[PDB]
mmCIF file with all atom_site columns, C-alpha atoms in Angstrom:
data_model
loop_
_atom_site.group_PDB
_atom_site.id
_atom_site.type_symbol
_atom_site.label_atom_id
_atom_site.label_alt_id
_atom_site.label_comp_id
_atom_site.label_asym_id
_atom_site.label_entity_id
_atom_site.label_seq_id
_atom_site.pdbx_PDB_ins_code
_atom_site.Cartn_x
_atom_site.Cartn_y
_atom_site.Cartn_z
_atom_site.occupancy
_atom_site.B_iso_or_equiv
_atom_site.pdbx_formal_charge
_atom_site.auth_seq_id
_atom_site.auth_comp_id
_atom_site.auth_asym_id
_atom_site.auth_atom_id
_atom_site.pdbx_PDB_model_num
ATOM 1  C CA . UNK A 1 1  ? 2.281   3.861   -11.829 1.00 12.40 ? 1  UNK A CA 1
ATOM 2  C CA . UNK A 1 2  ? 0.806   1.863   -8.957  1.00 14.58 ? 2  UNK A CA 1
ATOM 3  C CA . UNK A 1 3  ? 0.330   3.958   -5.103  1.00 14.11 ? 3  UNK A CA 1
ATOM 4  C CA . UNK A 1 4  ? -0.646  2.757   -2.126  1.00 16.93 ? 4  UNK A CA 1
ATOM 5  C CA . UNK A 1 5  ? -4.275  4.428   -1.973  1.00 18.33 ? 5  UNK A CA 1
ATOM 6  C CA . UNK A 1 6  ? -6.516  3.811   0.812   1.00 16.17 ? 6  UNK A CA 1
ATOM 7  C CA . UNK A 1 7  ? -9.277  2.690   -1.394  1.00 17.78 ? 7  UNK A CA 1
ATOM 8  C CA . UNK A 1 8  ? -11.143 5.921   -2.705  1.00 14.64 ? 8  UNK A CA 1
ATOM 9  C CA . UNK A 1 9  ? -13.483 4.429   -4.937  1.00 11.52 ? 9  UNK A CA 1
ATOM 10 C CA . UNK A 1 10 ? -14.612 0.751   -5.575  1.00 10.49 ? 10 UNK A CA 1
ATOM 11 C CA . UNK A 1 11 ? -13.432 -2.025  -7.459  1.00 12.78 ? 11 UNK A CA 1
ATOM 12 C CA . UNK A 1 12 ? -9.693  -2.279  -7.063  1.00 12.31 ? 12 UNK A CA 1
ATOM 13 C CA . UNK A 1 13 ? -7.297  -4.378  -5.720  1.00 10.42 ? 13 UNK A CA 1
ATOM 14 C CA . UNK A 1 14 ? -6.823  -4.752  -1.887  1.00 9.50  ? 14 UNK A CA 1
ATOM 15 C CA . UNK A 1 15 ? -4.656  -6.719  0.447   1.00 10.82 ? 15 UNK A CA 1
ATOM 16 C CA . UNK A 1 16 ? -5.069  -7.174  4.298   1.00 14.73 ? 16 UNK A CA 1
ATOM 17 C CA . UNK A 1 17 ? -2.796  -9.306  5.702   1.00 12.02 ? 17 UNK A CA 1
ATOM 18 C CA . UNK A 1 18 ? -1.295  -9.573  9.999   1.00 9.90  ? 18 UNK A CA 1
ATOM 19 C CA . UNK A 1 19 ? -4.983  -11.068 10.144  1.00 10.92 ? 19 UNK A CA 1
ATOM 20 C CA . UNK A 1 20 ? -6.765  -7.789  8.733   1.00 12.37 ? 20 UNK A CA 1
ATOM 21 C CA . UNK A 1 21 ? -4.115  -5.512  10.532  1.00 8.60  ? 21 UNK A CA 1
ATOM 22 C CA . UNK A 1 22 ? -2.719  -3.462  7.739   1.00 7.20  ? 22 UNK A CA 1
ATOM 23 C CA . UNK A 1 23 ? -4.757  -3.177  4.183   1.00 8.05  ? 23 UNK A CA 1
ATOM 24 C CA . UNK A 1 24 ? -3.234  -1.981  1.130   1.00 8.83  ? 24 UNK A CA 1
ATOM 25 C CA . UNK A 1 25 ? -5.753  -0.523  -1.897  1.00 10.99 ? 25 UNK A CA 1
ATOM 26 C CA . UNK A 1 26 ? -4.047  -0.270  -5.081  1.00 13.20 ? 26 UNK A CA 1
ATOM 27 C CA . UNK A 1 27 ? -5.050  1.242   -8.229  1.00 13.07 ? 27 UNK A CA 1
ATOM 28 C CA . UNK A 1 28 ? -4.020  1.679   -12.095 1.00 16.46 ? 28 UNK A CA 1
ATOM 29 C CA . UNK A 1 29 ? -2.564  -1.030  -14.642 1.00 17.05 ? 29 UNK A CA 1
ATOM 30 C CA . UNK A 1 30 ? 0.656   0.388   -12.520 1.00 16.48 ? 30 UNK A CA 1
ATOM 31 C CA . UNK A 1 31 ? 2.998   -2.526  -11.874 1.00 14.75 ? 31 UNK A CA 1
ATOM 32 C CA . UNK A 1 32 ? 5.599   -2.228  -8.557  1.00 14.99 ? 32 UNK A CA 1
ATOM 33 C CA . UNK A 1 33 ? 7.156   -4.373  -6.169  1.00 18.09 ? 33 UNK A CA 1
ATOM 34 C CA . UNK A 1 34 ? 5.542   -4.807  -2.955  1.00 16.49 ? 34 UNK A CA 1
ATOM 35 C CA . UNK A 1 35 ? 6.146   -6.512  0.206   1.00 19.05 ? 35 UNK A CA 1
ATOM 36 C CA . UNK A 1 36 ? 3.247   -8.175  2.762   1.00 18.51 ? 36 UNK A CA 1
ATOM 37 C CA . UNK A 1 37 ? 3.422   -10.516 4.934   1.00 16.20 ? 37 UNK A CA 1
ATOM 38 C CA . UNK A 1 38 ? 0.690   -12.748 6.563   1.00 15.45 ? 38 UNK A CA 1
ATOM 39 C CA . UNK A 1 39 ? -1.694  -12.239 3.786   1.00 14.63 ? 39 UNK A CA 1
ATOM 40 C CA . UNK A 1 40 ? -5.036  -13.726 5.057   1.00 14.86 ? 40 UNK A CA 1
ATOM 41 C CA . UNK A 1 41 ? -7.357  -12.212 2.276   1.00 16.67 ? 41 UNK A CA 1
ATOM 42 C CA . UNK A 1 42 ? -7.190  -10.575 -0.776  1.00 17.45 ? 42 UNK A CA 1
ATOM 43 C CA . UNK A 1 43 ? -9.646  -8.313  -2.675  1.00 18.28 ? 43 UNK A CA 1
ATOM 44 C CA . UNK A 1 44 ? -10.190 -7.655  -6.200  1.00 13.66 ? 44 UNK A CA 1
ATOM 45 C CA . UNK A 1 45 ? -13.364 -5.639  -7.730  1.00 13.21 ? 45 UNK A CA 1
ATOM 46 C CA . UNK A 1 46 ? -14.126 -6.251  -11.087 1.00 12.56 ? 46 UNK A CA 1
ATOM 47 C CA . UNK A 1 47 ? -10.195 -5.988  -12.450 1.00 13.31 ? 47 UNK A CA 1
ATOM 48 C CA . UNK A 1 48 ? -7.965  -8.383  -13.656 1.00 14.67 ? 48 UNK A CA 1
ATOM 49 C CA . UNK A 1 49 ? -4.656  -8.419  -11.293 1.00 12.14 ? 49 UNK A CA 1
ATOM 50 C CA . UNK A 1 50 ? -1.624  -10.620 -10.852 1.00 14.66 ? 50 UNK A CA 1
ATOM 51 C CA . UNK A 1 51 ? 0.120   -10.838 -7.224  1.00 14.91 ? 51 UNK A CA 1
ATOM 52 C CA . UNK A 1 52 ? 3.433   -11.925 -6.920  1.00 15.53 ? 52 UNK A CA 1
ATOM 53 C CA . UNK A 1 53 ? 4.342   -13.320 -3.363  1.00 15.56 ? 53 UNK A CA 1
ATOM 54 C CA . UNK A 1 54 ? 6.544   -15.564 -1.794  1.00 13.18 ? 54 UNK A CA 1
ATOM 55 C CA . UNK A 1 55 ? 5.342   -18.488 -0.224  1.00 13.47 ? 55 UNK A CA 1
ATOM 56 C CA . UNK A 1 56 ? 8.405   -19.210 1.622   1.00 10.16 ? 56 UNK A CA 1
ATOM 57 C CA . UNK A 1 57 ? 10.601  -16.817 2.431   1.00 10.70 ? 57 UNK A CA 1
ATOM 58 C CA . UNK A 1 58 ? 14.263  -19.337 3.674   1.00 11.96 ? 58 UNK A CA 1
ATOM 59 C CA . UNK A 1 59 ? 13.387  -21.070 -0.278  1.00 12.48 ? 59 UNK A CA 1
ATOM 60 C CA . UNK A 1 60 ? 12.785  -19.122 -3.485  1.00 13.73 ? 60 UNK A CA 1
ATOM 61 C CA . UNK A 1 61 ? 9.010   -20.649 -3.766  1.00 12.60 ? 61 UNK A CA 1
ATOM 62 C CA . UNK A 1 62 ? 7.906   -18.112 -5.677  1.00 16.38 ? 62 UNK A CA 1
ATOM 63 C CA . UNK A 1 63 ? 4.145   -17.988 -6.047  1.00 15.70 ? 63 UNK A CA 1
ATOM 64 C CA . UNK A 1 64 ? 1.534   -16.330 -8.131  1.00 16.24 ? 64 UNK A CA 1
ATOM 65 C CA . UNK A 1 65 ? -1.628  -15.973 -8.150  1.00 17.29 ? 65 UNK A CA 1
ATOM 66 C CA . UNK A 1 66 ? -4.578  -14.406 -10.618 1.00 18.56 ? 66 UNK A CA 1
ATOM 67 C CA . UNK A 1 67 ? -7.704  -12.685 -9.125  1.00 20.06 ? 67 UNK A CA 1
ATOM 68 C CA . UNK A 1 68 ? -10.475 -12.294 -11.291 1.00 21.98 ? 68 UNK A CA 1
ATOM 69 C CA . UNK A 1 69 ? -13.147 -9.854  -11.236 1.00 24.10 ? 69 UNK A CA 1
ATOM 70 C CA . UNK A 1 70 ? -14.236 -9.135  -7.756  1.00 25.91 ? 70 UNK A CA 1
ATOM 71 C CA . UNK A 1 71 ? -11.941 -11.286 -6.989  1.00 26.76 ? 71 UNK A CA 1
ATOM 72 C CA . UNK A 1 72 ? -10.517 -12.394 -3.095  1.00 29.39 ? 72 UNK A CA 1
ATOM 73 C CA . UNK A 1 73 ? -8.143  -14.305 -1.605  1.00 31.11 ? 73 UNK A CA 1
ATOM 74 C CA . UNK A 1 74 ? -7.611  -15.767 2.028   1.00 29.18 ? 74 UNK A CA 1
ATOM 75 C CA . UNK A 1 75 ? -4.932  -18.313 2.183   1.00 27.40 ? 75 UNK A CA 1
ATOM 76 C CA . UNK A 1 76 ? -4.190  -18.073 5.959   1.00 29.59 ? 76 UNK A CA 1
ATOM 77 C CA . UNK A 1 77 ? -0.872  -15.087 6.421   1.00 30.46 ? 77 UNK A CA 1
ATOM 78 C CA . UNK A 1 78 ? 1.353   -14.758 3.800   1.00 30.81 ? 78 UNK A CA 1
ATOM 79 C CA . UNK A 1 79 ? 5.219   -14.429 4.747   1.00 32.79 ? 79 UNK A CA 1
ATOM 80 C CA . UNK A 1 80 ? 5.787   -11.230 2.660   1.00 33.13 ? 80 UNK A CA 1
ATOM 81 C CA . UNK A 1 81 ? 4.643   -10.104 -0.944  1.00 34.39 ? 81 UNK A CA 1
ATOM 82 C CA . UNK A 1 82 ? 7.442   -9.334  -3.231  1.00 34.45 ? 82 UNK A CA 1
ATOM 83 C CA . UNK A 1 83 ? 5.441   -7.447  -5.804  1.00 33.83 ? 83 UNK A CA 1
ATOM 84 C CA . UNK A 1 84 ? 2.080   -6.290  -7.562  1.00 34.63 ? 84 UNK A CA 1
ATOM 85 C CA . UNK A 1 85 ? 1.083   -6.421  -11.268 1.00 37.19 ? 85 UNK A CA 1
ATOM 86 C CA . UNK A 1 86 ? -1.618  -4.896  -11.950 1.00 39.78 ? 86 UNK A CA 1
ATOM 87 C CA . UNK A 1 87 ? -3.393  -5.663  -16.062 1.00 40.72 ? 87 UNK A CA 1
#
């Protein structure tokens, strides 16, 4: 079951996207849709986790992405995620 957790511990998965305006921590193998837009960077401690965004939002380009451990990403604002799979 994967919650929105403001990142109690370390080594999890975290997204901050509106430039580092809003950052999500997520924890557990849990698997849920999610939605973020303008992902600039993502973080992920030493956990495999798949995110599942979409590039453009007017065409299905759907887009995924694998982050290793301790893991990050910063692509440069991400329309909107769609949803979070966590392994």
């Amino acid at each position: 079951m994967i919650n929105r957790t403001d990142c109690n511990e370390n080594s999890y998965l975290e997204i901050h996207n509106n430039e580092g305006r809003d950052t999500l921590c997520f924890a557990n193998a849990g698997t849920m849709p999610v939605a973020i837009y303008g992902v600039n960077w993502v973080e992920s401690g030493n956990n495999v986790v798949t995110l599942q965004f979409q590039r453009n939002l007017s065409d299905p380009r759907l887009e995924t992405i694998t982050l290793q451990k301790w893991g990050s990403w910063n692509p440069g604002h991400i329309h909107e995620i769609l949803s979070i799979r966590i392994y």
